[PDB]
Every structure is written in structure tokens, then in C-alpha cells.
Amino acid sequence: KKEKVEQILAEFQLQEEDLKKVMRRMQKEMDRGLRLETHEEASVKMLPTYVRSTPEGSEVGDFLSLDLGGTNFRVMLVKVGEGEEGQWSVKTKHQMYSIPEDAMTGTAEMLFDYISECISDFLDKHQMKHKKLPLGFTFSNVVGLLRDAIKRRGDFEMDVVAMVNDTVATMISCYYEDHQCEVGMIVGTGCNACYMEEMQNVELVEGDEGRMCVNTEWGAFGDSGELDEFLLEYDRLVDESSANPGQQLYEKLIGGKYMGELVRLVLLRLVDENLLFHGEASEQLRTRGAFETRFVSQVESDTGDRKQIYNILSTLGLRPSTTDCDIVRRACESVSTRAAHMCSAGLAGVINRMRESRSEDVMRITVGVDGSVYKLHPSFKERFHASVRRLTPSCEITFIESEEGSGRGAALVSAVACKKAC
């Protein structure tokens, strides 16, 4: 009769006036991360990449793929251009090197030197030895071992941003299919985004001609107390128990890493005052990391017969009723929505900036998306879109998932090898 749960789950309710507020606070702190002066002060660092569209003969899709496994080591060069028919085209080049016994059997340093030797070769042959190409390292500190071996060598030099995230590998893997794709986003265990920004608005780069992919690193949003007012009790507790207190606050409101725990602490708030398991805090329910995120995905995939939900509670030593199990539906529901609504605020802040940096009133853009929390969570993928389009009028957004059978920095190498076939 109380309906007190609705009062508690109101804590997670965010109105549009609140979401726009985030979007603005978001745009501000990613402007600061682009401005040379306020870069070191900014939570959102907005690091750039080697991914760029420029007159000097660089297009988004240009890529250098290293793959290693067994004695064999492969190198691929992806290059985007314009075809004979002036068509958007792609051309690939491959080369396979054999690793000597002594190098493979030897150290890690003995190895990445042979590697940096076989890269100079490949690049000196295709005349691409100093044209800084995005880098990805597939397999069958590693990011640094490779840089070191090169610095020791004297042929050429790569910066630390050559290596691409999974967020940008996403964007590219999608761009090959949907050239209008200029945003890339991950929402899984973690959360991060990248997008194409006007080189003139990027101060941390030498050049104002063209546009560049910028890794936002927006997970650290809130580290400067930009969110102090949106944070709840439950939100602060996780941070104090986490390995990185006072960091990645934004990514924590949405992380698939701490999404499950965020339900648990809500349940422990209900048992303390309310009729949820009649005050019985289970032996497992009081344990940290018990309530895995894979649960909230299951409870919300419940076909309304409660069976899928019972199967989870019957695992936590909990024997529920027809009443309390449906609150757990509402608990997860109240988090999932906030996780989506929060993510939609950030992505809107990006899109709206791309429209302000463009002389178009209507912007038909495309987004390359990936992530467990996105692709598998039942309701998340949608309630997300909804919030976004409410925050970005005059923008025909088109979302596209990165295809399966492919993970990272290799979706990219496969998604391209399947387009020389054209």
C-alpha cells in the first residue's frame, strides 16, 4: 500500500532539463580538453589519433595491421582513395615474415626488434615509411615494447597514439560500410567514445586542414566534480570501494563492470526499511561482486512469467515471492534507464557540437556502436536512442552495430579484406 519503492526509484529519475544540463557540462569539459591551455586541467582529455582526413594523402580507413602467432608474422596495409571511376575505393597489401629461431626463443626485446625490422622493410617498399598510419596489433605493455624497439632503431618514429582503441576500430570498421559514420562508441564493461573533429578546432595538433578522430576518454567525466549533484548514495559507495576512487565517475554510472553492484546496494536499501525478502539479507546478497551484471540483462529478458528472474534469486539463496521479484525488475529498470539516459547526454553533446562546426541545419550522420551492455541488454539499446534523438533535433542519426565474428583491431582487418573483394 505504501508505494515507497516508487519514491526510492525516483532517485534514478532524470528529466530532460537535467540531461541537457549534462550535455552542456559535457561539451564544456571536452572543449577544455581540446584547448591547449586547459588540456592538463581537463577531466576529458580528448586525446587525438593518427586517424585523419587530410590533403597530404590521408583518409579515414588508412591503417597498418600487425598480426603475430607461431613463427609467422604478418603485416597489412589498408589504404583508402578514389578509384578509376572516381569511386570510393580500398586497396590492401600483405607480407608475411618468418621469425628466426633465436628471436622467438629469446627475450621480448629480441623479438620486437625483429618486428620493427620487418616493418621498416614493408613500409620502405610501399613508400609509406614516415606517413604516420594508425596502428593495431593483433595476436594468435605490448603497446610500448613496439615503440621502444623503434626508438632504439633509427629508421622512423611513432607516437603513443598510433595504437587505436576499440572505440575507434569500431568507427572505422563501420565507416567502410557507412561512409557517413563519423562517430564511434563503446558501451560494455567500460565506456568511451571517439569522433571526427575539425583539425582547426584541435589545438593539440599541428595543422588546421581537415578533420581528425579524437578519442574523448569521457569516462573521466565528473572527476572535477561536474556531476557532484547527480550522484546518489549508491554512486559514491562504489567509488570508495573501487580500485580507482575519484576517477572514471561517468563510466561508473554506465559501466557494465559496476552496473550489477549498483543494483545490489539498492536491494540492501530495500531490505533495511522495506518489504524486500522480508528483511532477510541473504548470505550471498551481502557479498560484493555477487550480483553480476549478466543478471540485470537476464531479469529484464524475463517474458513476464518470472521464471528467468527466479532462476537468479534461487542462485543467491533467495526464495522470492510474486511481489518482490517484480521490484527487482523495477530496480534494474531504474538503473538501466539512467545508464542509457546518461550515455545519451554525452553522445548528444558530441553530435550537437559536430552540427555547430558544420554549416548544415540538418545533419544526417551515422554512429558506429559496439558493447555488451549495448548489443545484448534488451531494453538499453532502444531507450538510449530515444533520449538521444530528443536531445539532437535536426539530426537524422543512424545507428549501426559492429558485426560479430570480430572483436577489436581485427574487425577492422577483416572488414577491409572483405572490400578489396569489390
Binding site: 597514439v161 593539440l204 599541428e206
Partner: protein, 567 residues
């Protein structure tokens, strides 16, 4: 936008023919009339402003002074670069020489290592060498009097030029003064089949020194004038852009050194990059050096705090150590070493050290200050070991990094107020890194020159913007010394010379032999004398004598306060 200027050029300053006869490299800067009493924050701003004038593109509609961005200079730079690439294509019998005295000479050294490194990186035979007056010892020490010989420069050139077929000789003299350079230029023009002389300085040719050279029949102005004539036939080139006076009068090591650095690096990089329009490219590079100015001086607040730290140590009879990694260590050494002659510091006061390709540390004390200068591409393990041992608590570091890299956690704890300089990425094929290196060297130089300059000013060792306590160690400085007397006394040229010579030879008598003696005699006798300037000046202002002035100064905290009081 005729020139895509990054940082705003400073507001045009006071400069014209009515301002002063005296060439601009020697003129007092209108922005520093109150330098003597400025606080740390105001000093960084002023010297940063002065440093920026080098980038300032022409002002008035009528060129009073061909500035750096003027069409004339860029064209000349292009023309010279045209000649260099012809040599680079023919390494066999080819050689590229850079020459100068003092700091101009030290930049040449720096240029030769770096550009030889570039060729080596391409698997090419290194073609650069440097010639510094007094030889390699002059790179690290004050041996300025050695430049007063034209024959020495020619002699040093013949040895290195031996067996070559085509040799470019870039003679650098900010003030257009050094006989050492003049002799080389003159010699080259008698044989244009082999030699191509290039003159670098920052006054109009008409303001070049025209006093007699002890071992040469042509004056500096005369050799340069012949080159100007010869430039019309493309057999020689004169590159003399306007950059303006130093924040500290005659301190050619500062703006002049930075300007020396930028002019040569820009045109030479362009030549290597070219091998046909490179006008486009020369500007791209110049705009790179321009950005290094904003990046460095955005840290003005931290520089001022540092200025106070160094100044505090020195006032307290402390010592200053500059520990630099790789080529930044050389830059550190060059800074400290220049303080000896520029000012009156001891060689122990400020010293640079090079880590890379135990005696000091064990003897370091708590009143000493140590500054560490490195990049994040350096051996941070070696840095950390040395850093941890020093604790000696009065420490700070200057670190250059590329966007994306972050300083290790342990170094953050050791340096909670580190001077962090962030650099945007360069997409220059191959030379990206070389340009990256040069701007880092220039940045370090600006900080250190600003710090050391600022550090001495706070102790009252200057007056307005002049080296009042200067020691007359060569002929250029002698004329400079003389000009200072005319400026502050307002008395005739004749009255000031007599007083100066009397002070040099003091306690010796006046005579006809001294008045007619060659300048070379005066330099040998004067080079080791002290407080020569303040004695001569006090004698002039109070109608007094040299002995009365000497008693007064000893009773005073400095030569400066005594003169300010008299003025």
C-alpha cells in the same frame, strides 16, 4: 592573411631612424626601460614579448626595417636553400660549413650535429661541419677576444675545406661585427668557383661596423657591401632580417641566438625536404617555431616561481646546477657558461651537465639548486635514480612531452610543481621529429635565458636594460662600453673615450701613445680589469676622480646603486 600568423605578433614598437643612429642590435629596447625594478612575473612577460618581436611581420606601410616575414628575406632564404640542395646532390667534394663567434658559433655547432644526424638517418654521408672562433674550447667557455682575428677564421676554414670542390660558408654575426666572419666572406668572393658565402645578421648592412680590422684591409661594412653587390649576380647572399634589440642591451645570445637558430633551421630543413615550390614549406616551419613561443610562455607563472627560487639561492651564496639529457644538456651548458661574461657570476654559479653519450653529486650542498631538464623519450630510470638521491630539497624540473604521453607516478611525487610543456603532433614526413627536436631546444633556451637573465636583474646587477658591470673582454664590447657612457652622461664622444681609456690603463698616466694605440692593445690590458665601467662613469657624473669613486663603491652594496644615486 598574407602570413598565417599563429601567436599574435606584439603591438608594433618604437623603431625608426629618429629613434637612434646606433644599430638596432645595440639599441636600448623601448619595452624594458623599467627592467631593473620589474618583479619576476613582469620580467617573464617582458622578455617573452621581446622574444616574440622576431616573429612580428612588418608594421608600418613603408618598410623601415626588412622584418623576418618580409618578401625579401624569404626570397633570399629560398635562394640560399636553392644553392644548398645543389651541394647536397653532389656530396662528393661537397661540404657545408656554418661559422660564427661565441653563441652564434655555438648554434652552428648545434646545427652541424643535428643536420649530420639527419643525413645519417637517411644513410647519407654527413656533409656538415662547424667553425667556432677559438675552436672547440670556445663552445663551452668564454673566449670572445679570439674573434678579433680575421686570419684565424680563414685559417680554420682552409683546413676543413681542404680537398673539396664546392663549399657553402654561412658566416653568422648578429651584430655584423666579428672580423672572424668578415675575413671568411672576403676570401670566398675571390674564388666563387668553389666558395658560396652567406652572411647572417640582424642589422641593415648600412649599420654594420665600419671600424678598421686589425688584420684586414676591409671593414665589416665594406665586405658585406660587396656581397650585396655580388648577390645581384647570385654568387653570394646577404640575409639580414630585422628582429629588433635585446631585452638586455647587446645580449645577442637571447633573441639573436633564437633568431639565428630559427633562420638556419628553417631554410636548411626546407632544402632537405624539397629534394619545385618550398616557399609554402618554409612558412610551415616558421609557423612551427612560432607555436613554441606560446607553449613555453603559457608557463610564465611557473617560470616566475622558478626565477625566484634560483635568485634566492644565488643571493644566499648558493650554486646552480643544470642537469640536461642529451642535446638539452648542451643547451643548459651554453646558458650557464654565457653568464660569466654577460654578467659577473662565477663559473661555479650556474653550470650545465650532460647525461648520456658521481663527482659533483657527492659534494652537492643544501644551498645549491639543481634543475633537471629532459624529455619523456629519455631514460626515465636514469633520471629517477639521480632524482631520488638528491634530497637538496630545492628542486624543480622542466619536461617536454608529446600529447598522449604521461609522466610516471613516481616522478609526479618527486616534482609536484613540475614545468610541463606539451607539444602538438607533427605530421612532417621524416623531419617531423627533427623539427620536434629543434623547437624543444629553442624552448629550453628561452626558459633558461629568461631565468638566468631574470635571476641577475633581481640582484641589482644591471641598470635600466644595460650590462653596467660589464667586463671589456673584446673590441665589440669596448665600443658597447663607450656607447653606454655617451648614453648615460650625454657628454661628447671625445670626453667619454678619454675617461674610458684612463680607467682601463689606471693607475697609468695619460699619453699620446695611448690615444693613438690600436684597439688590440686596450683589449689585452682591459680584459682582466674590474669595475672599469662604474669607475669611468662616476668620474664623469660628479666631476670627480677614479680614486674618489673607488672609495664610494666599496662602501656601497653594488656599482649599480651608487650610479643610480648619482643620476
Amino acid at each position: 592573411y598574407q602570413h598565417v600568423i599563429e601567436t599574435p605578433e606584439p603591438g608594433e614598437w618604437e623603431l625608426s631612424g629618429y629613434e637612434a643612429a646606433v644599430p638596432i642590435t645595440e639599441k636600448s629596447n623601448p619595452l624594458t626601460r623599467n627592467l631593473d625594478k620589474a618583479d619576476a612575473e613582469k620580467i617573464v612577460k617582458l622578455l617573452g614579448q621581446c622574444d616574440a618581436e622576431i616573429f612580428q611581420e612588418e608594421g608600418q606601410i613603408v618598410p623601415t626595417y626588412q622584418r623576418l616575414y618580409s618578401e625579401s628575406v624569404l626570397t633570399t632564404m629560398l635562394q640560399v636553400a636553392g644553392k644548398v640542395q645543389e651541394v647536397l646532390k653532389e656530396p662528393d667534394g661537397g661540404l657545408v660549413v656554418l661559422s660564427g663567434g661565441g653563441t652564434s658559433g655555438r648554434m652552428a655547432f648545434l646545427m652541424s650535429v643535428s643536420f649530420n644526424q639527419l643525413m645519417k638517418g637517411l644513410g647519407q654521408k654527413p656533409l656538415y661541419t662547424y667553425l667556432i672562433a677559438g675552436g672547440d674550447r670556445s663552445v663551452v667557455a668564454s673566449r670572445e677576444q679570439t674573434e678579433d682575428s680575421a686570419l684565424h677564421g680563414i685559417e680554420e676554414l682552409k683546413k676543413v675545406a681542404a680537398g673539396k670542390k664546392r663549399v657553402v660558408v654561412i658566416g653568422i654575426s648578429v651584430g655584423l661585427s666579428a672580423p672572424f666572419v668578415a675575413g671568411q666572406m672576403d676570401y670566398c668572393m675571390d674564388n666563387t668557383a668553389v666558395f658560396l658565402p652567406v652572411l647572417v645578421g640582424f642589422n641593415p648592412v648600412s649599420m654594420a661596423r665600419n671600424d678598421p680590422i686589425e688584420d684586414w684591409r676591409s671593414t665589416f661594412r665594406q665586405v658585406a657591401e660587396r656581397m650585396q653587390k655580388m648577390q645581384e649576380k647570385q654568387e653570394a647572399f646577404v640575409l639580414n632580417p630585422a628582429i629588433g634589440p635585446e631585452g638586455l642591451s647587446g645580449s645577442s645570445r637571447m633573441k639573436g641566438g633564437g633568431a639565428t637558430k630559427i633562420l638556419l633551421e628553417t631554410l636548411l630543413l626546407a632544402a632537405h625536404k624539397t629534394v619545385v615550390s618550398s616557399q609554402r614549406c618554409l612558412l610551415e616551419i616558421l609557423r612551427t617555431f612560432e607555436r613554441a613561443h606560446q607553449v613555453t610562455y603559457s608557463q610564465s607563472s611557473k617560470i616566475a616561481t622558478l626565477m625566484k627560487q634560483v635568485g634566492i639561492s644565488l643571493e644566499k651564496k648558493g650554486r646552480v646546477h643544470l642537469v640536461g639529457w642529451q642535446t638539452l644538456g648542451i643547451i643548459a651548458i651554453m646558458d650557464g657558461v654565457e653568464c660569466i661574461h654577460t654578467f659577473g657570476a662565477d663559473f661555479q654559479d650556474i653550470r650545465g651537465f650532460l647525461i648520456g653519450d658521481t663527482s659533483i653529486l657527492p659534494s652537492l650542498t643544501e644551498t645549491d639548486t639543481v634543475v633537471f631538464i629532459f624529455t619523456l623519450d629519455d631514460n626515465l630510470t636514469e633520471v629517477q635514480a639521480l632524482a631520488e638521491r638528491v634530497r637538496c630539497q630545492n628542486i624543480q624540473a622542466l619536461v617536454h612531452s608529446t600529447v598522449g604521453q604521461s609522466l610516471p607516478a613516481p616522478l609526479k611525487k618527486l616534482f609536484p610543481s613540475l614545468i610541463s610543456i606539451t607539444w602538438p603532433l607533427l605530421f612532417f614526413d621524416y623531419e617531423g621529429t627533427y623539427v620536434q627536436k629543434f623547437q624543444r631546444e629553442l624552448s629550453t633556451k628561452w626558459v633558461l635565458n629568461t631565468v638566468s637573465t631574470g635571476a641577475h636583474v633581481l640582484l641589482g646587477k644591471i641598470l635600466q636594460n644595460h650590462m653596467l658591470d660589464l667586463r671589456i673582454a673584446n673590441s665589440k664590447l669596448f665600443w658597447r662600453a663607450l656607447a653606454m657612457l655617451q648614453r648615460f652622461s650625454g657628454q661628447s664622444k671625445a670626453r667619454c673615450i678619454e675617461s674610458l681609456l684612463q680607467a682601463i690603463h689606471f693607475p697609468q698616466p695619460l699619453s699620446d701613445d695611448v690615444r693613438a694605440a690600436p684597439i688590440s692593445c686596450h683589449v689585452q690590458v682591459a680584459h682582466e680589469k674590474e669595475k672599469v665601467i662604474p669607475t669611468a662613469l662616476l668620474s664623469l657624473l660628479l666631476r670627480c676622480s677614479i680614486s674618489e669613486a673607488k672609495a664610494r663603491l666599496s662602501a656601497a652594496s653594488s656599482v649599480c646603486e651608487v650610479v643610480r644615486s648619482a643620476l
